[PDB]
Amino acid sequence: MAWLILIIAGIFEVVWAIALKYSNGFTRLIPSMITLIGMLISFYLLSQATKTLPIGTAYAIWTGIGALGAVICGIIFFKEPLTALRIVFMILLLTGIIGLKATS
Amino acid sequence: MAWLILIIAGIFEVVWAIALKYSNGFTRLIPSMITLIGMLISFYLLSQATKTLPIGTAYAIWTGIGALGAVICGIIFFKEPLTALRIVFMILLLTGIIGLKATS
Amino acid sequence: SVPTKLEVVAATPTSLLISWDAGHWWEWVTYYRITYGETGGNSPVQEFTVPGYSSTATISGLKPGVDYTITVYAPTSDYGSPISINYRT
Amino acid sequence: SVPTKLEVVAATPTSLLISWDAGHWWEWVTYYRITYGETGGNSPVQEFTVPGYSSTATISGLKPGVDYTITVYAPTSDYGSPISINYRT
Numbered sequence: 187m188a189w190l191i192l193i194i195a196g197i198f199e200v201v202w203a204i205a206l207k208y209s210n211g212f213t214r215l216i217p218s219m220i221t222l223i224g225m226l227i228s229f230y231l232l233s234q235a236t237k238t239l240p241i242g243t244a245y246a247i248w249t250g251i252g253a254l255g256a257v258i259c260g261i262i263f264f265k266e267p268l269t270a271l272r273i274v275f276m277i278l279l280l281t282g283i284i285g286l287k288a289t290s
Numbered sequence: 291m292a293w294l295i296l297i298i299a300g301i302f303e304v305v306w307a308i309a310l311k312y313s314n315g316f317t318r319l320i321p322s323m324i325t326l327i328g329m330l331i332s333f334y335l336l337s338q339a340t341k342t343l344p345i346g347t348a349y350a351i352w353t354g355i356g357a358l359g360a361v362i363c364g365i366i367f368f369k370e371p372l373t374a375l376r377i378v379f380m381i382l383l384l385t386g387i388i389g390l391k392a393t394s
Numbered sequence: 395s396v397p398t399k400l401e402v403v404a405a406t407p408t409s410l411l412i413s414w415d416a417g418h419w420w421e422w423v424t425y426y427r428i429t430y431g432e433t434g435g436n437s438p439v440q441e442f443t444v445p446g447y448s449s450t451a452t453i454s455g456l457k458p459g460v461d462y463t464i465t466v467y468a469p470t471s472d473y474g475s476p477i478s479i480n481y482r483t
Numbered sequence: 484s485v486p487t488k489l490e491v492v493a494a495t496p497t498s499l500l501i502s503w504d505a506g507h508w509w510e511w512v513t514y515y516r517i518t519y520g521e522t523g524g525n526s527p528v529q530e531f532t533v534p535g536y537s538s539t540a541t542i543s544g545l546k547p548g549v550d551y552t553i554t555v556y557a558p559t560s561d562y563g564s565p566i567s568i569n570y571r572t
């Protein structure tokens with residue numbers, strides 16, 4: 187459940203991350219607003235998850251979901267080159283996340 | 291120059307991590323405030339170190355220091371698990387993150 | 395036990411200035427939530443939160459000559475122990 | 484691009500009620516800074532800001548019978564040139 191909250195925190199993290207670059211200099215109302223909300227929610231759910239999860243693990247999985255969402259979105263949406271290296275790295279990242287959840 | 295500012299940004303990354311763990315979900319004032327201000331500091335110093343250094347390697351080293359030091363201080367302060375599995379899967383996870391952010 | 399020593403600093407037929415002990419800097423919380431209502435009953439109890447960097451708070455809009463209970467809650471009751479008082483305006 | 488169509492909706496000897504077209508949702512800025520001054524320049528001008536979720540704004544304390552220039556700036560010059568109009572109260 188804290189792991190589910192952590193997944194969702196990483197999701198809102200990547201969402202506010204990209205809505206941040208879609209806001210120019212924090213001036214476009216709708217994107218700046220998405221970022222504000224997603225920041226509040228990402229960090230709030232992250233704190234809630236840290237209440238019951240080890241900090242070095244919760245932070246690492248949160249950052250990992252941030253990075254994986256960032257890449258997955260770049261490849262899918264913003265037309266990013268999918269390399270063998272990036273595939274191997276996403277595999278390492280998912281394996282790390284899954285194996286961390288698997289040693290609870 | 292900007293390399294050491296990047297190092298310091300990663301240090302404040304682990305700082306607001308550990309301060310978030312102490313805040314018991316943004317309830318204890320001071321750890322919550324160390325968290326907020328350490329966030330702001332890390333982000334500003336990241337902007338500083340990134341207006342010179344490559345965003346790829348800058349983010350790579352930044353989140354690497356953040357995640358690794360969070361794992362370390364978790365194993366230390368909150369005496370979080372230091373098993374063979376957990377460390378191996380943390381290695382996989384951090385290498386995946388460092389690799390994905392070093393190829394963007 | 396945060397907080398401690400909830401007392402009515404100043405008062406008026408229609409308002410109370412209350413204060414409490416925020417405790418030591420590791421007991422300081424991000425916010426307190428204050429509740430106040432007619433000790434009799436009748437209705438529910440009014441409520442508002444207050445920043446944790448504030449040991450005092452004012453309660454306005456009250457009936458004169460009426461006895462109100464006033465509780466002060468921490469975010470959680472981990473070290474929390476809601477301290478309440480009674481004051482008749 | 485934004486903002487557009489700065490028209491004085493209403494007017495009084497000492498007050499104007501202006502509005503603009505905020506645009507499409509992806510053009511909505513976080514705030515517009517409105518600046519009104521005597522259309523010549525006696526000493527400074529006068530300026531306030533308005534949250535980007537608002538397209539109308541009222542202006543008060545104007546000298547009756549005086550022509551004023553009223554500009555509505557986006558947060559940055561990227562969005563567009565600052566539109567402005569003239570109006571004698």
Ligand SMILES: CCCCCCCCCCCCP(C)(C)=O
Pocket residue numbers: 225226229230315316317326469470
């Ligand atoms: C910018 C930092 C993240 C946003 C702050 C969130 C504050 C929420 C406080 C948590 C409330 C504790 P509870 C158990 C009554 O919900």
